[PDB]
Symmetry: C3
């Protein structure tokens, strides 16, 4: 009966009300009630979005790659990958700066030795890259492996267009029927996304409420300085790095944020950027006028290998652990941090649990090892204690970057529909 009220204001209301409710409920210790009675609605939201990810990516990308020439596709890939690597480097640098500014971990005062022992491996760059090519697309679809689905969909769309420009008519009509099936399937997926966003304010309320209820009490002391530094840094990544790059390429930054708000809040509360994809792709299509041939490729690629927020978070936690055990990082060490954070975004691309794998990687890069019972393990466990509060903002900036790079690359390909940007 509440469907008639506008949706976007509803999602903002749910964000604020779930936040206030969760703080008030967890401060009085009723956070277990929140986990039991409030959370499953946010879980329902998250499952409803996650359901759409595999069909909408596959279908949108067959369609888009078909509707575009391979030369342009390759050009878009080169552009978006450069944009991604550059923005990740910027975000590590920002995390380093805001951490040094907030002087994070300076008052934990742990005594620490000089011992160093490795934990996880980087999956070999060669094996990860080879793993981009699926050996069974039905299996990748069933397993939800995004990158090989991207690869298979691109190949299929390119094949479909080559077949449609052939002389035999049976060939054209077959390929055309196939492309119709993908086109209808993607059309339906975006329809359902719009339907689920009707339920979205409830889920936003529930997710933000549970995260504030379980982890609000923990935002005090040195971890409070961590939360403040991380969130200020994310804010800087948005209002400086994104606004300036959007301003250079002639996109009004405020119009961009106003349009992106739904994808942003969905990322902020589901803490899954892949599970925000249906909202992100529909936002790119029906708000920013990006052509399917751009966003249907850049946005899943970006959910997988483009996490500015995570990079900034790594920049803060390396400072936190280093200052916490008493060995602040030398300039060259911070350069090593930036370099390895970007290389680690590439190296763990698509690997499950790559969050902790990259963090172990960066820490290992400057000589901070997670040996059990050591002070470094202790400080890292300190951070993981507020990892969810951080995950909200981290995921939000991860998705927002994807949208900003998609709009920039599109404007540079004249595949951006200007009619949506007129006041």
């Amino acid at each position: 009966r509440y469907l008639d009220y506008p949706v976007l204001w509803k999602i903002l209301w749910g964000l604020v009300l779930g936040a206030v409710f969760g703080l008030i409920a967890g401060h009085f210790g009723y956070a277990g009630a929140v986990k039991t009675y409030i959370k499953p609605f946010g879980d329902l939201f998250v499952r409803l979005l996650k359901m759409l990810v595999m069909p909408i990516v596959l279908a949108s990308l067959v369609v888009g790659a078909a509707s575009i020439s391979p030369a342009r596709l390759g050009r878009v890939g080169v552009k978006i990958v450069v944009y991604y690597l550059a923005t990740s480097a910027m975000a590590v640098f920002f995390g380093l700066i805001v951490g040094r500014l907030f002087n994070v971990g300076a008052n934990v005062n742990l005594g620490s030795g000089t011992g160093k022992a490795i934990e996880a491996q980087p999956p070999s760059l060669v094996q990860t890259l080879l793993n981009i090519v699926p050996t069974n697309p039905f299996a990748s679809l069933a397993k939800g492996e995004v990158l090989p689905v991207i690869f298979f969909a691109i190949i299929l769309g390119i094949a479909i267009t080559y077949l449609m420009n052939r002389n035999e008519e049976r060939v054209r009509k077959s390929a055309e029927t196939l492309l119709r099936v993908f086109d209808g399937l993607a059309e339906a997926m975006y329809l359902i996304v719009g339907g689920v966003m009707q339920y979205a304010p409830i889920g936003v309320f529930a997710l933000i409420a549970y995260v504030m209820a379980e982890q609000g009490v923990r935002v005090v002391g040195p971890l409070a300085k961590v939360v403040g530094a991380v969130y200020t840094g994310l804010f800087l990544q948005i209002v400086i790095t994104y606004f300036i790059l959007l301003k250079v390429f002639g996109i009004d930054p405020i119009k961009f944020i106003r349009k992106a708000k739904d994808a942003m809040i969905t990322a902020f509360v589901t803490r899954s950027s892949s599970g925000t994809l249906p909202v992100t792709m529909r936002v790119a299509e029906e708000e920013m006028g990006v052509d399917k041939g751009i966003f249907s490729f850049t946005l899943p690629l970006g959910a997988t290998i483009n996490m500015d927020g995570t990079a900034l978070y790594q920049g803060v936690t390396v400072l936190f652990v280093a200052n916490a055990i008493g060995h602040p990082l030398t300039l060259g060490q911070q350069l090593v941090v930036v370099l390895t954070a970007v290389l680690a975004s590439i190296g763990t691309a698509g690997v499950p649990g790559a969050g902790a794998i990259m963090l172990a990687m960066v820490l290992q890069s400057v000589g901070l090892d997670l040996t059990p019972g050591s002070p470094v393990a202790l400080a890292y466990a300190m951070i993981l204690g507020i990892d969810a509060i951080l995950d909200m903002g981290r995921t939000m900036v991860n998705v927002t970057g994807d949208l900003a790079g998609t709009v920039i690359v599109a404007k540079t390909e004249k595949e951006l529909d200007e009619s949506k940007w007129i006041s």
Copy 2:
């Protein structure tokens, strides 16, 4: 050269001849010979039907949900879910009455104390409900999970019609092609079902022969009284609850039974209600003139959450165990049994191995705990010795109940083709 003989007579011939053959073979100790040389033909039958179950459900429901309004679909869902719960409670009630009538387990005379060991909880009501929404539909498909497939199929068909009512013609043609692909897939599945029913008499013979050969010798003494009670009770659920409910809503009970006979025998020999689905849906369409938009939703839902036969069986075996250890159940305990049996059919919806889980739930509700080496454990182990003999009948009544509810709901929606019911 045998195909020419009519199918229905062939299936009856296979049923009766397999029963007599299996009894004669288990009496002469050749039941292992039956397991080795006769059984694989029935296994072949079962594999051929189970092969069709996933595609036919996915496609028939995309199509059906497209051909119907969401308001009507929801109305049908409420009708069938009410019908399901009501007939399930009735079946527990009948099992209790037929159990008291046969005085089941009265002469086992096991001594059992007043000792009580606390056990684990039943699978969560909330998580099974959330499990209805898939997080990857390709994955639910690969795993054979019916309920998430129903959910995805309904969402997809609804999206498809809303797309077919758009102004742009490319969108309509895309959606129309997608629907054509699903319509062809469903037509082919039903074609194949009819082909498999030609091989059905052989497999029916083999399955009934293996079950009689392995478990004929065990229908003696107290377990024979159990078999008599359970089969009498199922017969009552059919001839009282189903016939009275069909007469109340104006469906000829005898024509119903005659049309459902193929689904009935198939369920009785395969003891899997989910695997009789292709035959059941074919009977709903090409024998009872039920509209696809009703049965394509109610019949898979019914295979999953509507087991009158299992409910009656639980009523009989809970009385059997209570009498065998020497503590007959008080009236309020039997009420607790009925309430718990229905709620446990809901709570275990789609859960693998849900049969024993429901039985454990019902037993624990009245304080008969299955501690190993206890007399209660012994009584349950007695019953399991005849589980196949019982499984035939209870699966049969499970599926027949599904059909009766589909025909009644269709009749109330004027979605029932009256021409198939006049001679």
Copy 3:
């Protein structure tokens, strides 16, 4: 600068140069460099082909089985199954003969008793056949199970044609839309196969280089005599068994080999006959003019259950193991070897790891049990040390056999497009 160069010359160049590069690199011990820097390009080739296998099999067979009568489908199946069994028995027989000729394992001189404790057992034939019928075709697709996919695809195509010959227009239009979705999918797949064959010279070079670099050093002494015996036997299976059967049914054997070349080299370096399937089928369609209704059924079936090369290898290795432990095989024991090798091709149909399982079966059939630490176990490990050098050749002859039988059945069904066999 690459694509314009002719294709056949490039793949042969990559094969010869990769082999010489790998020998020279492993003969000087740089095989670790090859495994690290050269191998991953060949791995990329193998994955690119493996990707296409499930889609192309499903789609080609829905389309093909629709485009053919069920009576003809059955006739083709019986023909190709007889051909497969006969050519397999011939291959075990040839392996025995070339083994006797090279006197394989004759100078290993291990002492062996006559006690044998049963360790292996056969996987049930009945369950192996029943597994042909999938119980979830989406699951068989996701698990990469070929044989049950074949079954589902044939059922679906047959249903589709029966629907397309019905009175209602809506049903025809539905079934035909479905058939076109599969036809479009298959057309795209073959398009992609041809595209991937552009990278083939690199990947062929890399695979052959890695195998030569890891295993060249081991082709000396008794295992060298094994390599010579096996490759001679494979060559004979091609030049006698295949050439005579093609000549008998009126197919020019030289035209045949010239056409099969891509499938042959691809099978030879990837050592996966199922994973060579996309190249084999594109060669059958776009080189030999076999109708989709023949090859879309016979080639994946043969990739799964028809291994002339593996059978010849078993023929050689059983004589090798027997001579190596000092108990040469009786004539009737050799007949049991042939009979069980053929039966073991069926009994493991689609079973994972069926290579070693068939070898264990054939060994056990003549009383050589692979109990750990026994001398028979030791001789088997000797053989396994060169399994890659042997896998190249036996996979090549496996696939070549599939092609030859497909073309013969096609000639007998007048489903072979003779215009592809006229030279100017």
